[PDB]
């Protein structure tokens, strides 16, 4: 259950094997080595006999590193074919992805193959239920091999696809659907990645990990499909990073969000209010214009009707975004997910977590009782 | 106009100081128009990312319009001027200003040195 601290995403293969042997000697019955596409292409999980090698989402991975598309999928297929057993390896993957079918075509054909696609009729899996919500999204899966009940996912399609892919692995061990109750409970536990709303009765808070433009865009689209009323987001850019990434990120954020807050997610020795101006230049605004408008009490909106806010410090802006939210609306924090490190300059501070959001959602009641207005960025302070 | 047409007669190219504002429409042919500090409609939407890539970014350094504390000219057009650039006024404002100043000096002249005129209907004319 415990996980050792590792700097890289994929540790050394020899060290991983030694840790797995030490665990299997005493304190663990099974040693499963799971690595991502980059870890599998590097050789971390490749040098290990994999009983079940399935892909959750097959697409162009490590295209800039490996230099060729479908390289990670081919490496995973080769690693699975190296150590393969009859009717023991699972090929559960979405049928819509062509890389998944290309990887399933390679290797030993005696291995069991199955599809977890919902729209495909050959996969026989389908949600067949309408219970999507920010707290829990239960589906009644009706498949011959898959379990009946499904796991409550925070996302509309991504979490549903993950639950459908995990249902196959859960049913492979046990045909009874009662054994998947623990897996469904663990999936609804709101992990670090694509976290769900808090259990407390308050506005929805979704902590996500979105840094690349495409992932940020797809997460924003999924939130728009899930967000009933408003889409409130707050994020920032890292210093000495891709300079062209900031304007496209700001544009993709402002295109579909009504109100967005721009902060400094990772200063890392880079001057503040500089990359913030870079993000502001995406919507055509300059920090000078917003500052000279801030002396007034108007704050004109965007031409498309949306609104844009910004602040230097991360804590106060995040607390305001958590407080500036409607009942049916949900607040999305795509700046950082499972990460708990904020490097402001040379020193780093570990002051980024969900406990701050919980404290803000608890104290917003006292704020409203005091009479403070948190509708927009210029809080109307009484006298 | 006179200052411009006096240049090609002497065979003098335009100096490289054709400074454009943050809104990429400022030139010697833009300030005198009636809309000031306003982008012009060019059909398709403004390619903000393309403008960002063309003007700078992704390499070197970009002119960041961020206020600072040091007494340094922020706008790149106030580099040579001692104090600051002159007040921005369109051609209509300057024309009405010169017209009202002309009428003001006319009335100032007629007040003191203009009590008598050729017209002998002053009782109804001066009022």
CSV table of C-alpha atoms in Angstrom, one decimal, chain A residues 242-244 247-248 271-275 277-278 281-282 284 287-289 291, chain B residues 22-23 48-49 52-53 57-68 74:
chain,number,residue,atom,x,y,z
A,242,UNK,CA,7.5,27.5,-23.1
A,243,UNK,CA,6.8,31.1,-23.7
A,244,UNK,CA,4.3,30.3,-26.5
A,247,UNK,CA,-1.0,32.9,-24.6
A,248,UNK,CA,-2.6,29.8,-26.1
A,271,UNK,CA,10.1,37.9,-12.2
A,272,UNK,CA,6.4,38.1,-11.2
A,273,UNK,CA,3.9,40.3,-13.1
A,274,UNK,CA,5.9,39.4,-16.2
A,275,UNK,CA,4.5,36.0,-17.2
A,277,UNK,CA,1.4,40.1,-18.5
A,278,UNK,CA,2.2,37.4,-21.1
A,281,UNK,CA,-1.6,39.7,-23.7
A,282,UNK,CA,-3.5,36.6,-25.0
A,284,UNK,CA,-5.2,41.5,-26.0
A,287,UNK,CA,-1.4,44.9,-17.2
A,288,UNK,CA,-1.2,48.7,-17.5
A,289,UNK,CA,-4.8,48.9,-18.8
A,291,UNK,CA,-4.3,48.5,-13.4
B,22,UNK,CA,0.9,47.9,-28.0
B,23,UNK,CA,-2.2,48.0,-30.2
B,48,UNK,CA,-3.2,37.6,-30.7
B,49,UNK,CA,-1.0,34.6,-30.6
B,52,UNK,CA,2.8,37.7,-29.9
B,53,UNK,CA,5.0,35.3,-31.9
B,57,UNK,CA,8.3,35.8,-27.4
B,58,UNK,CA,9.7,32.2,-27.4
B,59,UNK,CA,13.2,33.7,-27.8
B,60,UNK,CA,15.2,36.6,-26.5
B,61,UNK,CA,13.2,39.3,-24.7
B,62,UNK,CA,9.8,40.9,-25.3
B,63,UNK,CA,8.8,44.4,-24.5
B,64,UNK,CA,6.6,43.8,-21.5
B,65,UNK,CA,4.1,46.6,-20.8
B,66,UNK,CA,4.5,46.4,-17.0
B,67,UNK,CA,4.7,49.4,-14.7
B,68,UNK,CA,7.8,49.8,-12.6
B,74,UNK,CA,7.6,53.4,-20.2
